[PDB]
Design a protein around this ligand. Structure first.
Ligand SMILES: Cc1nc[nH]c1CN1CCc2cccc(N)c2C1
Length: 150
């Protein structure tokens, strides 16, 4: 009973989280996951500031209101060569990654490791935070408040 949460650097408090390295997070799960990180779904303005500080991914993720990919460098296989906060317009499907916003993070680029999920609650799951440099932090608990997500 095990979940990997792969996390990125924070940029102006904004970071990307993916579950088990594959698109698998619902919109309700995304809100609960950010909450477990004492974070919220970013606004578009928070995301645009993060982009200006150096944030880009090649993954669709929830923010408040939309599914987006922040892009700095044009790449034909990421957001169809767009730059800026690319907004996903047309999709059949409902499960992506998520972005989260932590107001207490440093103002610019923070590529230190994440080593806690401070607001997860009691539960049976072995949750492992996986950083891009391979650093891991594990705890037993739960973050999903919606039965449909479990
Ligand atoms: C290349 C790729 N395919 C699906 N997701 C991804 C990006 N992942 C790749 C796996 C991974 C592991 C630990 C931290 C981070 N940020 C990531 C980012």
């Amino acid at each position: 009973n095990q979940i990997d949460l792969n996390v990125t650097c924070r940029y102006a408090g904004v970071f990307h989280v993916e579950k088990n390295g594959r698109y698998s997070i619902s919109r309700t799960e995304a809100a609960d996951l950010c909450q477990a990180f004492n974070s919220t779904l970013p606004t578009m303005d928070q995301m645009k500031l993060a982009l200006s500080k150096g944030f880009e991914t090649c993954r669709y993720g929830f923010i408040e209101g939309n599914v987006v990919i922040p892009r700095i460098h044009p790449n034909a296989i990421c957001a169809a060569n767009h730059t800026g906060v690319y907004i996903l317009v047309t999709s059949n499907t409902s499960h992506y990654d998520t972005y989260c916003f932590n107001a207490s993070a440093p103002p610019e680029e923070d590529c230190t490791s994440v080593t806690d999920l401070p607001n997860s609650f009691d539960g049976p799951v072995t949750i492992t935070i996986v950083n891009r440099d391979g650093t891991r932090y594990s705890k037993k608990g739960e973050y999903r408040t919606h039965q449909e997500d479990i």
